[PDB]
Design a protein around this ligand. Structure first.
Ligand SMILES: [Fe+3]
Ligand SMILES: [Fe+3]
Ligand SMILES: [Fe+3]
Ligand SMILES: [Fe+3]
Ligand SMILES: [Fe+3]
Ligand SMILES: [Fe+3]
Ligand SMILES: [Fe+3]
Ligand SMILES: [Fe+3]
Ligand SMILES: [Fe+3]
Ligand SMILES: [Fe+3]
Ligand SMILES: [Fe+3]
Ligand SMILES: [Fe+3]
Ligand SMILES: [Fe+3]
Ligand SMILES: [Fe+3]
Ligand SMILES: [Fe+3]
Ligand SMILES: [Fe+3]
Ligand SMILES: [Fe+3]
Ligand SMILES: [Fe+3]
Ligand SMILES: [Fe+3]
Ligand SMILES: [Fe+3]
Ligand SMILES: [Fe+3]
Ligand SMILES: [Fe+3]
Ligand SMILES: [Fe+3]
Ligand SMILES: [Fe+3]
Ligand SMILES: [Fe+3]
Ligand SMILES: [Fe+3]
Ligand SMILES: [Fe+3]
Ligand SMILES: [Fe+3]
Ligand SMILES: [Fe+3]
Ligand SMILES: [Fe+3]
Ligand SMILES: [Fe+3]
Ligand SMILES: [Fe+3]
Ligand SMILES: [Fe+3]
Ligand SMILES: [Fe+3]
Ligand SMILES: [Fe+3]
Ligand SMILES: [Fe+3]
Ligand SMILES: [Fe+3]
Ligand SMILES: [Fe+3]
Ligand SMILES: [Fe+3]
Ligand SMILES: [Fe+3]
Ligand SMILES: [Fe+3]
Ligand SMILES: [Fe+3]
Ligand SMILES: [Fe+3]
Ligand SMILES: [Fe+3]
Ligand SMILES: [Fe+3]
Ligand SMILES: [Fe+3]
Ligand SMILES: [Fe+3]
Ligand SMILES: [Fe+3]
Ligand SMILES: [Fe+3]
Ligand SMILES: [Fe+3]
Ligand SMILES: [Fe+3]
Ligand SMILES: [Fe+3]
Ligand SMILES: [Fe+3]
Ligand SMILES: [Fe+3]
Ligand SMILES: [Fe+3]
Ligand SMILES: [Fe+3]
Ligand SMILES: [Fe+3]
Ligand SMILES: [Fe+3]
Ligand SMILES: [Fe+3]
Ligand SMILES: [Fe+3]
Ligand SMILES: [Fe+3]
Ligand SMILES: [Fe+3]
Ligand SMILES: [Fe+3]
Ligand SMILES: [Fe+3]
Ligand SMILES: [Fe+3]
Ligand SMILES: [Fe+3]
Ligand SMILES: [Fe+3]
Ligand SMILES: [Fe+3]
Ligand SMILES: [Fe+3]
Ligand SMILES: [Fe+3]
Ligand SMILES: [Fe+3]
Ligand SMILES: [Fe+3]
Ligand SMILES: [Fe+3]
Ligand SMILES: [Fe+3]
Ligand SMILES: [Fe+3]
Ligand SMILES: [Fe+3]
Ligand SMILES: [Fe+3]
Ligand SMILES: [Fe+3]
Ligand SMILES: [Fe+3]
Ligand SMILES: [Fe+3]
Ligand code: NA
Ligand code: NA
Ligand code: NA
Ligand code: NA
Lengths: 175, 175, 180, 180, 175, 175, 175, 175, 175, 175, 180
């Protein structure tokens, strides 16, 4: 084995001793697993959303899933750069995720979206925490990447919140 | 006149005798008719869609019309390449169409969409039969082009079906 | 006079020698275009407002529509301002001035539902379209065909937005009581 | 029944009236495509894993290859999932489900050397290719030529990746004992 | 009314209670109004700049105005995401702006630019302050967006400073 | 010879008899001449501009030449479409031009620019009259194309006028 | 030597045993040779076409060469992937082709294009059988590629048939 | 006046003394004049070409004009850079050209293209000598530019020779 | 002299008094010199890398050098914006660099890369330090730019680390 | 036959008599042969490269084949423009080639590469002689095109030479 | 010898067998190109310097011009370095080496006004152009037409920059005492 899950060696290139590195890696791994379940649930909703607004949502959800995917990729790579091993198999990603994930049934779009927003909220707070963690270890690259992915995660979280708001152009009339 | 409607001459270039070619031509030209009436009816719905979801549907139906148009173009070009005469005038297209065609009035969006979905379904079933028929004649290029257009037609048809499904983000609350 | 600090005084129109447009004709266009610039920039700010705030089942489509509609208004206002300058006048500039010179009705700072918001934008669009229609004839009658042509170029875009908001507000939807 | 909260139950296939595919035929494809989706999404996660972790003399070329190969798998899985939905079934979704429904062999969480990792991806690719080959005939025999065509479109890409990993693993190199 | 100017509800999606949110929203709103007057004064100068260097300045000022516009947009959207109401009408934006705004006369380019730079300076210091505010509330997305717009605002502020410096290629000779 | 300079034949395709067409042709061909001499003189100024602002003016005059060239192209094509013979040789272009044309020496930038501005102004006034003349003949396409070229010519002319205005960032200080 | 011409080892990666693989290979290589001489012949005709319609044909022939080149590449790369040795040197490619190839003199453009046409037809018929062969061996990726290359070949052969058709805008008049 | 036609001051920047510079200038200007009348003649032919092959020739002639235009620009800009005055007005350009220019009547397309061809050949031979001249003066940048312009001129002259070649897809049959 | 090396005047535009500014400028200048030696050593290795993996490394090293170049540019510009003078001549950049730089011999790729990674490590730690410096002076733009360049510098540092890891696809077998 | 292989007619358009043209033609056609066999052999190596570095080499050899192909195209077009007949069939290309051509077996990568490098070297030396020969005939366009292709051929040849050099990131450690 | 650690020694030229250029001819080009690389890289650093620092009425146009002019020099130096390597020599690399091997005059670390700065760049450009002119003949006389052609490709760009700086410095301007 080149590396053992859970081993964190830091990096001589990046002058981050294993001690500091393992504190970021533990936090980014936790992020990774959550963000990857988020991606797979966004994919799910993307695939399955139906009804009057489905095309727009479909497009939104596919974009959102692309954005979680990229954030996952940046996390896992950071992990590795810090001498860690990013969670990889689907089983591992779900087991190490703390966020709640829907069972295999398909739910209606409102429920589906409120479940996604719950996920985002938990990721967003965790992420805020890890960025202060990274800055306090002086890992400013990690903190900068966490904030760069945060602002995209909150923009999708906020979109979803707007989808779920109590307004519409529909009227009883048109019904 | 350089060629007479209905005639099929095959093609020496393509090493397709008129007797095989007539078989695919008669099938392709009937596809052409139905696709071009589909194209016109999508155009109609694109122009006329109104209401809470209209911009999205407007784009979608635009794109589906462009897809229909390109399919029709490929079918007509293929008919010509096999030495046949592709149906051309709008009056002939509609007259050769087997699918149902709305009258000039403008129906509401769910009615229009369900009318389009029924046209898609007839086109999809005929296309499936035509691809078999082309493979059986060893006209693999034809069969191929039919599959390549089929998967586009099926994706549009499936999107319409999603639009019509019984889900929505709208709640009585928001109404 | 040689000694104002101001390069130009608000309200002065000086025509252009480059453009062979004397001050007399210029003033007639610049009066029209300034008044439009003011309305189109309040339109732009209200569309932004509605882009920012729209929520609910159709929000993302509206959010993008309304941002594109603000962009178009922005571009229209930029043309009209540049035209007023090219004609030797002073385009309305500060936000206060722009709203004060606008004749359209502007929402107060509360956020309303999307149908109310769209209806209010619709109303501004219409005012601007009737006015732009007038100003184009005005400009053609002055022989200022550049300005006329520009007014029509921007009119076609404003009417396209206005008409989209009209469709958004129409009584139809895919939604059924069933799926409710 | 009118009263499940679930819009759809995992494992139900309902065909599509749009697509003129009754539930009987649909179920046969959706069974095949679901099983593929599961394998292709575990493939995708393992390629990502190997993209993340590859190191050594050839790492940057492999890192880019393996990221492009994950992207392709991702796109393949997205097609297959969308197809399963279009056919009125429920594509496997959660990571746990996807791995549980995968028949391919997946590496444990340790990181292995690049030859071991590539070999393991190679093995998944092959399984997926033999299966996809079957499913394409399956689909053509059902007259579901759209699905068949899509399976072939994605098969050509998967085979191209599989074959590249084969070349990466071949016994040749520019490296000489000399330069060692 | 869906929302009242001045109301700040936080966001459940973004796990930001109204208490913390109202401290960012108050600061971003203040920013918004200033940045929107800045945009309208940049537009003004863009439109009106004349003389030997006017084309370059025109281009620079239009770019600068585009950049303030985008920053405004990111601010107002953040505000909304935080459950606030971003200042919207032109009247409101100018009244809530703290920066000084030129009267409707047109001034020469040097004066015009020195007035713009004053604006930028006030926005830049405010923005620095709000970013420490956001980080201290642990709103790291807001802080990250503030810094992302800061660095573009200081780059334009600095350009303007260079335009106004005491150098030129011109010589008495050439005059 | 396929056609003789001066002749105008109208066009059957365009349903424009030679008697209406001659009227627009004589106007368009006089525009063509003046625009092509404008184009050459902009080229000249583009090649020769020197001094503190030269790169900017160099680009500008380049672009304005390209605009002039495209206008000339549209005018000449239109003349041809109306069955006329567009003036072609450089000697004929200049000879048919009514505008003033610098001699071969190179003047300073303000002189050159003011010479161009005077050419623009003559072209703008003639274009305005030609558009009226075309609308009055019911040649709306012509009138349209003239308006579309006019607004470009007017914007270049206005830019030159801005260049010549009595403002600058330069101060005696910096000198 | 790493591999010997004519040997075909299949592929473990693609789960194609040597037996099935030798079948597709022997067909794909014989295509490869024909398609590469086609490529060189189109290049020839591309280089040499002269006369009234030369620039158009020059562009079409260059494109048709490029299409043949890419078909050749896909063929050869498939052969390799199946564990075979694609024919490589020019003399091997012409020796293994079954199509007729013009001698090194240059023929007028009708004769040249008629000869290409003969070449396309032969390739097209071969490709059709090979697609059937690959499908029958269950080598779907190979069949799918041959169909993809086929529709481009057929499009080309068909364009050449149109070039050669007995119509023209020319009239005696214009002679 | 800033510079006087015919004067050539060299360049200190380019370390080209007036003597060497006057040599390249006198050659480049005489190219400039010829290439600009070439440009206007191609424009003419572009505008006027009619008949069976007109759209293709129209596109080729427009491109060939654009190529000549850019060659002219590079020539004139080099002259300027060498401290000379590039010929500018249309009447100067035709007066200083040594090529033959068609009168203002419109000739059929063979005659028109034969005349262009005469013009290209003369320019091509001149350019060849000038490249030799520049190299001999050690003015490598000038020679390198002339070669770069030359290969594009030659490509054009050669296309015209192909247009005029005695072949065609037309047959009596089709007449 | 407009400015003296080492003088730092702050900026009125950016409301950064010279006192605070000189603390960032001193730190960014140190960064600049190091990052510019890094760029010149990356260029070196880019140019000279040979052997089995050279093309990929070449591409990687040229990209890395482009990224250091951009970071240098952002540093030097910040310096200037803060009223400082960025180190400019090559001599000055090397003298003020603290990182070790290879002599003019060419070393093998492994050695070359391990020398580069040493450089990156020193720059990365310095950069982390300066970002906390900038944040503590409330220069949040500087801190934001430092982090934006940090994350690219650590990504290259980490790549290099991966190149140097003890894995390969090579086997004794293949040797 | 429109032209007979070997004949060279020069060109009137290009003012190149057959006696000068034959000299460049005989040289260009021998280049063409060797370049097209180079192209085929690069194709071969592209298809067949395997092992630790294969993807990179695969791309490289692909690109170098495309470069070879474009060089061959330019050489053949030039031969045609000078009134010669470019060698066309694959059998003639190889037969006219003076370079060595692998037999059909597939060699290992270092052997293949060194075989290509030897073909490059013969082509580079001949090209150098041909450029001299073209300049001496005053065929500057030819000489130019040869230099423009030479520097591409030399860069590919130099890249192959880099691939073959005795360095690597691989260590016995990693083995 | 088998045992230097250095792969190549600075100053050694070994020709290339790939390029069929023996060491004797190569050395003559590599001497010329190295000397140019050094000057062009000091040019690049001084243009950067002036891009960074230019201020005043025309600064943004100059800032962009001078950044594009540095980019071109950078690209020129990269060609020349790669060429020196391709010819089996060792391109000057460290900043110290590059300036030490440069024959051009380089500004001290103070910032001068834009006319002084431009004049100083102009002076470097000229040196480089006269030298490049020589080296191109040198290379053609050696029959190294690739190098000659590359020298001319980069010469045309350097002369275009040099000539632009010449225009920037010319005695003309739109500015009048009036507007002063
Ligand atoms: Fe769907
Ligand atoms: Fe994605
Ligand atoms: Fe990645
Ligand atoms: Fe990584
Ligand atoms: Fe690692
Ligand atoms: Fe970013
Ligand atoms: Fe970004
Ligand atoms: Fe609420
Ligand atoms: Fe509509
Ligand atoms: Fe369409
Ligand atoms: Fe279309
Ligand atoms: Fe078509
Ligand atoms: Fe036909
Ligand atoms: Fe056809
Ligand atoms: Fe396709
Ligand atoms: Fe249902
Ligand atoms: Fe905008
Ligand atoms: Fe915009
Ligand atoms: Fe503007
Ligand atoms: Fe003005
Ligand atoms: Fe328009
Ligand atoms: Fe228009
Ligand atoms: Fe109604
Ligand atoms: Fe993706
Ligand atoms: Fe993707
Ligand atoms: Fe999708
Ligand atoms: Fe569904
Ligand atoms: Fe495809
Ligand atoms: Fe396809
Ligand atoms: Fe202006
Ligand atoms: Fe903007
Ligand atoms: Fe926005
Ligand atoms: Fe928002
Ligand atoms: Fe909200
Ligand atoms: Fe950013
Ligand atoms: Fe960023
Ligand atoms: Fe960014
Ligand atoms: Fe100062
Ligand atoms: Fe110039
Ligand atoms: Fe032009
Ligand atoms: Fe042009
Ligand atoms: Fe034209
Ligand atoms: Fe005509
Ligand atoms: Fe026409
Ligand atoms: Fe237009
Ligand atoms: Fe004044
Ligand atoms: Fe082997
Ligand atoms: Fe090609
Ligand atoms: Fe290939
Ligand atoms: Fe292989
Ligand atoms: Fe395809
Ligand atoms: Fe016929
Ligand atoms: Fe002077
Ligand atoms: Fe042009
Ligand atoms: Fe130019
Ligand atoms: Fe000059
Ligand atoms: Fe070029
Ligand atoms: Fe002949
Ligand atoms: Fe190299
Ligand atoms: Fe770079
Ligand atoms: Fe910069
Ligand atoms: Fe700066
Ligand atoms: Fe400064
Ligand atoms: Fe960024
Ligand atoms: Fe970015
Ligand atoms: Fe290790
Ligand atoms: Fe291969
Ligand atoms: Fe190619
Ligand atoms: Fe190609
Ligand atoms: Fe070609
Ligand atoms: Fe010929
Ligand atoms: Fe030719
Ligand atoms: Fe080139
Ligand atoms: Fe060695
Ligand atoms: Fe660069
Ligand atoms: Fe670059
Ligand atoms: Fe490079
Ligand atoms: Fe080397
Ligand atoms: Fe070039
Ligand atoms: Fe070139
Ligand atoms: Na809705
Ligand atoms: Na100035
Ligand atoms: Na013809
Ligand atoms: Na290797």
């Amino acid at each position: 084995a080149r590396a053992t899950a859970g081993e964190v060696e830091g990096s001589d290139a990046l002058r981050m001793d294993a001690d500091r590195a393992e504190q970021c890696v533990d936090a980014l791994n936790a992020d990774l697993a959550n963000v990857y379940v988020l991606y797979h649930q966004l994919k799910k909703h993307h695939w399955n959303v139906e009804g009057a607004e489905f095309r727009d949502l479909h497009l939104f959800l596919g974009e959102a899933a692309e954005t979680a995917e990229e954030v996952a990729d940046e996390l896992a790579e950071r992990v590795q750069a810090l001498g860690g091993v990013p969670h990889a198999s689907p089983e591992t990603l779900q087991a190490e995720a703390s966020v709640d994930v829907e069972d295999e049934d398909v739910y209606d779009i409102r429920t589906s979206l409120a479940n996604d927003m719950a996920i985002y909220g938990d990721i967003i707070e965790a992420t805020r925490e890890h960025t202060e963690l990274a800055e306090n270890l002086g890992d400013h690259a990690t903190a900068h990447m966490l904030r760069e992915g945060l602002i995209e995660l909150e923009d999708d979280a906020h979109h979803i919140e707007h989808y779920l708001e109590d307004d519409t152009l529909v009227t009883q009339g048109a019904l």
